[PDB]
Design a protein around this ligand. Structure first.
Ligand SMILES: N[C@H](CO)Cn1nnc(-c2ccc(Oc3ncc(Cl)cc3F)cc2)n1
Ligand SMILES: [Yb+3]
Ligand SMILES: [Yb+3]
Ligand SMILES: [Yb+3]
Ligand SMILES: [Zn+2]
Length: 607
């Protein structure tokens, strides 16, 4: 049972294919077209079925060349409206039919962000991008919006001829639009069955540069060069990910560097990963996000969570693989440094939510919960900590990597629950069931708060971060002059980020300490988005008024929720900036990504 979907479940009928024919209208901010769904009945005498929709205008439903009756139910908040269609003739089990729905999206579609020319790098053309995870595909097209159903897809997208369309599929040609010579139709094909949250679309003045045998980097012209350098390690990471998870089956691995308002660090859209431009640090230091999106080609896109209650299966296994790729490239000490950092981020989330909060559980219950509101680091890091604890318990990385590859092969092209994963883990590790039975499964999977056991981490790279952090925390006014730029000379950007993360966990620090830190370390000059975010949070939480314009600018010049949400919350919690934070949100709200605007509004308690 998928409590986030109002559609007929996979036990009633399954969508096998989607043929999408649509036109992107930038003047009306609409996507208009037909969604032809090939649906297979799973029951005898099937006479109707229900699909998910959200703010879609339905023109008609055609089956067998004739219009059929359909009805839209009452809207159910974030779930949208159910769409029940009456089939013209009763279907037997395993019988397939094609249902073509003529539809149009609302300009306020929660899946899309429509950008005016002024909001782009080039300033001449508008831009459109989608973000369907978790349940926003129903705000683009009528569908069984649940990851328990996997389908293939084809698409034909008509856009103004000067613009380029890309999808989470192999590019299958382009032609001038026969109905309008000012437009082009771009064609796409996704031959691997995917859950519908992996359907993606971008339309903009895009250019590409090849960076590997199976990778093009796409962005607006102004970002192509920087992006090609930033993501040059992509092919090396794909080769390591193939060694760990088995064959890459998607053909192409392209990257799209979105405009700054892209709400996440990355989105593992098959064939075309979407990434935030905030990764463009200039030194490849934020490339673990690419390793994470690459990892999703096995964990998430091949083996998918059956419902959003088992989302930890997607992220925990992906973080586990991501950290192995980064450990293959930079060493086992580095994999331990990243794993220990992840534990610290898990501490932060559990502190923020509270140790008894239902969203700190590994397996969650999203009945009447908007998945967007539930989103946090818990499925990522508590999921990772579980797998890292099992790796140590079961004999090391080489043994657990053998399980991981067999897990991916076992469940490729399927949607699974925590019980399916746990059963396979016990089957694979049959000779270690006595060891597995020592795990407190009820606490690990179903209890809130920090896990009952903390794994063993190598501290080599972390020690200098903890030591410098503790020097600053225990310093008094007469110790401030001992600090100097030389304190950071043997620290990598990762170690500087971990120093700030350790210090931010004990914030606020005295204002004089923060001012001294800017005096000697000049953290205000750092463009690296992770370091700048933590330093600005440290400044605002330590009540430095000078940091208010810097934090407001960072929160609005980009829109990656990881940065924008805590920056606005810190600005709202500081009395000196409270009114400015609320006013800035109000004046930027209309131009923000719809999901980000909703979440910042909830965080700020502004309706
Ligand atoms: N997947 C990308 C990383 O590569 C980044 N990303 N983009 N969108 C999303 C996204 C994921 C889940 C979600 O809802 C849930 N959150 C938490 C839980 Cl325990 C269950 C849920 F259903 C809402 C949004 N994650
Ligand atoms: Yb072709
Ligand atoms: Yb079993
Ligand atoms: Yb002293
Ligand atoms: Zn992920």
């Amino acid at each position: 049972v998928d409590t986030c979907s109002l559609a007929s479940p996979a036990s009633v009928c399954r969508t096998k294919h989607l043929h999408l024919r649509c036109s992107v209208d930038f003047t009306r901010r609409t996507l208009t077209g037909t969604a032809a769904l090939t649906v297979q009945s799973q029951e005898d005498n099937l006479r109707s079925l229900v699909l998910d929709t959200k703010d879609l205008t339905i023109e008609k439903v055609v089956i067998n060349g004739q219009e059929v009756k359909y009805a839209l139910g009452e809207r159910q908040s974030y779930k949208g409206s159910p769409m029940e269609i009456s089939l013209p003739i009763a279907l037997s089990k395993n019988q397939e039919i094609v249902i073509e729905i003529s539809f149009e999206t609302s300009p306020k579609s929660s899946a899309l962000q429509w950008l005016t020319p002024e909001q782009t790098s080039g300033k001449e053309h508008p831009y459109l991008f989608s973000q369907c995870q978790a349940i926003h595909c129903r705000a683009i097209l009528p569908c069984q919006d649940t990851p328990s159903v996997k389908l293939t897809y084809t698409a034909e997208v008509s856009v103004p001829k000067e613009l380029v369309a890309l999808m989470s599929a192999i590019r299958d040609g382009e032609t001038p639009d026969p109905e309008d010579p000012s437009r082009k139709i771009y064609k796409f094909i996704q031959k691997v069955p995917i859950p519908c949250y992996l359907i993606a679309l971008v339309v903009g003045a895009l250019e590409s540069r090849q960076i590997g045998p199976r990778t093009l980097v796409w962005s607006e012209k102004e970002q192509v060069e920087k992006s090609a350098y930033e993501f040059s390690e992509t092919e090396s990471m794909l080769k390591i990910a193939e060694d760990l998870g088995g064959p890459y089956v998607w053909g192409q691995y392209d990257l799209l560097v979105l405009p700054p308002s892209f709400p996440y660090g990355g989105m593992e859209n098959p064939c075309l990963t979407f990434v935030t431009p905030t990764l463009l640090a200039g030194d490849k230091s934020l490339s673990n996000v690419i390793a994470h999106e690459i990892s999703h080609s096995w964990t998430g896109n091949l083996v998918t969570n059956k419902t959003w209650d088992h989302f930890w299966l997607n992220e925990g296994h992906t973080v586990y693989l991501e950290r192995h790729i980064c450990g293959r490239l930079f060493g086992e000490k580095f994999r331990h440094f990243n794993a220990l950092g992840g534990w610290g981020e898990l501490q932060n989330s559990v502190k923020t939510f509270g140790e008894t909060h239902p969203f700190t559980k590994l397996v969650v219950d999203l009945t009447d919960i908007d998945p967007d509101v539930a989103y946090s680091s818990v499925p990522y890091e508590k999921g990772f900590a579980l797998l890292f604890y099992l790796e140590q318990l079961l004999g090391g990385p080489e043994i657990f990597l053998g399980f991981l590859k067999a897990y991916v092969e076992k469940f490729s092209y399927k949607s699974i629950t925590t019980d399916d994963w746990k059963d396979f883990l016990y089957s694979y590790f049959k000779d270690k069931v006595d060891v597995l039975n020592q795990v407190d499964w009820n606490a690990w999977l179903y209890s809130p708060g920090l896990p009952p056991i903390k794994p063993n981490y190598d501290m080599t790279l972390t020690n200098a971060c903890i030591a410098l952090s503790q020097r600053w925390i225990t310093a008094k006014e007469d110790d401030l002059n001992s600090f100097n730029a030389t304190d950071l000379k043997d620290l990598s950007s990762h170690q500087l980020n971990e120093f700030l993360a350790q210090t931010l966990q004990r914030a606020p620090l005295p204002l004089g300490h923060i001012k001294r830190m800017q005096e000697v370390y000049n953290f205000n000059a750092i463009n690296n988005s992770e370091i700048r975010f933590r330093w600005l949070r440290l400044c605002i939480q330590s009540k430095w008024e000078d940091a208010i314009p810097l934090a407001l600018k960072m929160a609005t010049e980009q829109g990656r929720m990881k940065f924008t949400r805590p920056l606005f919350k810190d600005l709202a919690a500081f009395d000196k900036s409270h009114d400015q934070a609320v006013r800035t949100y109000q004046e930027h709200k209309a131009s923000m990504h719809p999901v980000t605007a909703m979440l910042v509004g909830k965080d700020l308690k502004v309706d």
